[PDB]
Design a protein around this ligand. Structure first.
Ligand SMILES: [Mg+2]
Ligand SMILES: [Mg+2]
Ligand SMILES: [Mg+2]
Ligand SMILES: [Mg+2]
Ligand SMILES: [Mn+2]
Ligand SMILES: [Mn+2]
Ligand SMILES: [Mn+2]
Ligand SMILES: [Mn+2]
Lengths: 458, 458
DNA sequence: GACTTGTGTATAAGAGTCAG
DNA sequence: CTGACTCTTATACACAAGTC
DNA sequence: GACTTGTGTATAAGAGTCAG
DNA sequence: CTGACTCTTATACACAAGTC
């Protein structure tokens, strides 16, 4: 694991970039490390006062000989490298936009109405997770494009995104593709997409949107499914949250436990006369005034038993990870905070950030246990200092010196107060905590050094 | 000076609050220290994981027995205390708004159109500076109010703000009022205001807005002034900046040197037949396409010689400090980032922040020299660590171990790269640097401690 | 003296944000 | 697109420490 | 070998933000 | 309300270190 040490991390992710000059590759690694060390901050701040590094970083982000595609490819190859270690993987796939309003926006693509000031890119990503513990492995692919003002000018239909993602995946994963399960939201409810996966014997979990007919029974998927015997079901704890509409009316969404029934079955679609499985999760005795929870999922996976169908549900529930990634890239890494003047420059910088973003998520996961000493992830110095810092804050529930303790102590460092008592700290708080730990390490290490050379302190 | 040590700072500013219970007073001090230590962050983060402190802080901000007015008064009394030390003071006076859009906004006052979602308060402040070195002393007064949707419902004209500010000032400053020079923008070009100052024999510098006539010559102030002989003049370096209009068109404002002529004279206004002086600064051979620089200032101060008139100009140029304060309160302390649910709660919290804001400015000023050792402001440990940290970053121009060095080293810590080569770091960068210093101090001090108890490190 | 009010610890949840 | 949090405002108890 | 391209140091300034 | 900055993109030189 090259994660905690930014520099090592950077090297692991980008050392193989094929930029056409070993010098650009080394710079990319260096640029990425500083950004990673100063997650979310500006290039300048990341430079720690080094003129040369600052100049180096800017020169690189505007280097017309550096391909952003090649930079994203490099990091993707590392994900592939890492993926060899797991028998089953989840390929989470979704689209987001990168929005800007500064001068360059004029040179970017449409995101809303033709007149909107905010313009930028649509980015279709594939986020790989290991299917046993669901940890985040890394990005596998990104497709970036600018939507034209006039659809007529489009080079191709955007719906082809899924398929291009699959082609890239399959080619980067080679013989590992068989261990991959593609996870997509309703937008992927495209028969052409389904056909293709099936044709390659590839795996997937796609939520259904359209009313489709089941060839055998001739009923609509939903109906055919309602006819299937209940397998059992499951419960979900829906947490409280405040809600605001399009108009800005605010209202509360109190917490609640939802009970769902689970049914599954085999279906067949006319298109290519393809066969696949389906699962239907639907809320029983839904509240008086709430929109019932309902998921109709299409899949390649087994669904016969309650266990197999629930497995499908668990898989689809992991799709949300990509949403966290979106936020980590934006709010976390600062994707939309960048102010490069030319599309290509901004693209280069932002591409690097996509990796920083995945790291933000991994950091947290690294502190998340499945009683494993904290010494497994931290240095002895990190340990010592942390202990010092946490003095007296440890709760009974936390085994002294454990991985669990390190997690809370770091979060605490980050301000975490477990307000809802879930025990779960945000990836933002954890980063905040780690950042503080690291900062304080510098001071600690500075003292240590001075003593080592017989120097008196203060 | 109780500035650098947050706690001591808090005590100095608020220890005399008259809250009706010594317990609320001690809490206020404590609340303020944590906020000051964690400038700009949330109450929770400021709590360093302490449930009791967090609970204490919230309880206080919603305590119906705590008067926000009393909290602002307390800090103002400290400014008064401090003011005794200077022979001449500048009372900078201006209005800003505090804007919110969350649920409470409905309970706040109008700031724009009757329908605007953003509502909140208008706050008229007096910011005291020492007139020799222009350092920031502190806040002297704040008047907060909610503007009614219908003017008809207003309790009084908002124009009375200046006068109420003067009444409060005079009463808090007592015999020191004579050393005070009131500094106000054109909005203060109110004859009733002028009369009042004059009547109390009080001093001021008010920019002129309206065309007024000079009783003696019977010409308009501007004209009468143009007739006065030129005293000499002055130059200004107008720096480059990007500019954006109301509509969002962006355009450059390149740097330039402006040459101004200076004239002065005595004038008399019909209202109360009052006499006062005036100065007129007007740009000579102004550029082809720029809006000419022009200041017509009304004052109590001497204007006869070039020196005396320039003095007036320098004074008025210091008005901008209040603008920095506005930003420090908002962007810096987080005034508008607060999300308290009731007007009174938000008011209490935000009132505390106004002091935090002044401190942000003072911090910087504290590192600003007029070759005074850094040891005058920093601890030996702070010094040592800082030196360690800055290793190799010092520029020749900076005398090793000086106040000047500490300034740059801290700024550097804050990311400063002197992009425009002015040599001046923002108050934001300086805080960032100080914050880092402090953070790193914790680690340093933690090491020091451990050694002291024979413990091996890492 | 007779009553309130704050604190440190507990429990719980509404309000607000940026991802959808 | 079946969310995941933090900020903010309560509630309760056994004291402490305030007011009038 | 014959030409480009990056680096560390320099100089300068346009673009963008939140205060007005 | 006569702004004060940081972020970002150049320019130039003497080398170094790349490509083809
Ligand atoms: Mg295989
Ligand atoms: Mg931080
Ligand atoms: Mg006097
Ligand atoms: Mg900071
Ligand atoms: Mn989607
Ligand atoms: Mn004003
Ligand atoms: Mn999405
Ligand atoms: Mn103003």
């Amino acid at each position: 694991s090259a994660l905690h040490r930014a520099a090592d991390w950077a090297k692991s992710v980008f050392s193989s970039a094929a930029l056409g000059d070993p010098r650009r590759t080394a710079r990319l690694v260096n640029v990425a490390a500083q950004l990673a060390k100063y997650s979310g901050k500006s290039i300048t701040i990341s430079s720690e006062g080094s003129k040369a590094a600052q100049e180096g970083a800017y020169r690189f982000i505007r280097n017309p000989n550096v391909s952003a595609e090649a930079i994203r490819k490099a990091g993707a190859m590392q994900t592939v490298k890492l993926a060899q270690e797991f028998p089953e993987l989840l390929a989470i796939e979704d689209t987001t936009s990168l929005s800007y309003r500064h001068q360059v926006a004029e040179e970017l693509g449409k995101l809303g109405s033709i007149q909107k000031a905010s313009r930028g890119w649509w980015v279709h990503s594939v986020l790989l997770l290991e299917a046993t513990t669901f940890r985040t492995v890394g990005l596998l692919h990104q497709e970036w494009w600018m939507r034209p003002d006039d659809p007529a000018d489009a080079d191709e239909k955007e719906s082809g995104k899924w398929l291009a993602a699959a082609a890239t995946s399959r080619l980067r994963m080679g013989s590992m593709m068989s261990n991959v399960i593609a996870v997509c939201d309703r937008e992927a409810d495209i028969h052409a997409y389904l056909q293709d996966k099936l044709a390659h014997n590839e795996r997937f979990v796609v939520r259904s949107k359209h009313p489709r007919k089941d060839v055998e029974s001739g009923l609509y998927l939903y109906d055919h499914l309602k006819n299937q015997p209940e397998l059992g079901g499951y419960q979900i704890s829906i947490p409280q949250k405040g809600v605001v509409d399009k108009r800005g009316k605010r209202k509360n969404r109190p917490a609640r436990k939802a009970s769902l029934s689970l049914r599954s079955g085999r279906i067949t679609l006319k298109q290519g006369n393809i066969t696949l499985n389906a699962v239907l999760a639907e809320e029983i005795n839904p509240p008086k005034g709430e929109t019932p929870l309902k998921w109709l999922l299409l899949t390649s996976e087994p669904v016969e038993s309650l266990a197999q169908a629930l497995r499908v549900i668990d898989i689809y529930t992991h799709r949300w990870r990509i949403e966290e990634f979106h936020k980590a890239w934006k709010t976390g890494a600062g994707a939309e905070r960048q102010r490069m003047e030319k599309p290509d420059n901004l693209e280069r910088m932002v591409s690097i950030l996509s990796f920083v973003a995945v790291r933000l998520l991994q950091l947290r996961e690294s502190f998340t246990p499945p009683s494993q000493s904290a010494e497994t992830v931290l240095t002895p110095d990190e340990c010592q200092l942390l202990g010092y810092l946490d003095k007296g804050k440890r709760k009974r529930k936390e085994k002294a010196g454990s991985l669990q303790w390190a997690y809370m102590a770091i979060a605490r460092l980050g301000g975490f107060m477990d307000s809802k008592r879930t025990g779960i700290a945000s990836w933002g708080a954890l980063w905040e905590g780690w950042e503080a730990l690291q900062s304080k390490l510098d001071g600690f290490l500075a003292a240590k050094d001075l003593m080592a050379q017989g120097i008196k302190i203060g």
